[PDB]
Amino acid sequence: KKEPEPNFQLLDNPARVMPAQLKVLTMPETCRYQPFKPLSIGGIIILKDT
């Protein structure tokens, strides 16, 4: 049949994130912004910028 399996997924800013799967958040690679604190914790966080 078909075995596509897109091994990773993109999300926008206000992201539904089930807690059990926060700890494998794939940070926005080489983005303009940078997370001020370890992304492993949920909720609201402030971003440093360039």
Curated annotation (Swiss-Prot):
Q: Which family does it belong to?
A: Belongs to the proteasome subunit S1 family.
Protein's name according to its UniProt entry: 26S proteasome non-ATPase regulatory subunit 1
- What lineage does the source organism belong to? Eukaryota, Metazoa, Chordata, Craniata, Vertebrata
| Position of the signal peptide | none
What is the recorded function of this protein according to its Swiss-Prot or TrEMBL entry?
A: Component of the 26S proteasome, a multiprotein complex involved in the ATP-dependent degradation of ubiquitinated proteins. This complex plays a key role in the maintenance of protein homeostasis by removing misfolded or damaged proteins, which could impair cellular functions, and by removing proteins whose functions are no longer required. Therefore, the proteasome participates in numerous cellular processes, including cell cycle progression, apoptosis, or DNA damage repair.
Quaternary structure (record): Component of the 19S proteasome regulatory particle complex. The 26S proteasome consists of a 20S core particle (CP) and two 19S regulatory subunits (RP). The regulatory particle is made of a lid composed of 9 subunits, a base containing 6 ATPases and few additional components including PSMD1. Interacts with ADRM1. Interacts with ZFAND1.
Quote the range of the complete protein represented: 868 to 917 of 953
Q: Which gene encodes it?
A: PSMD1
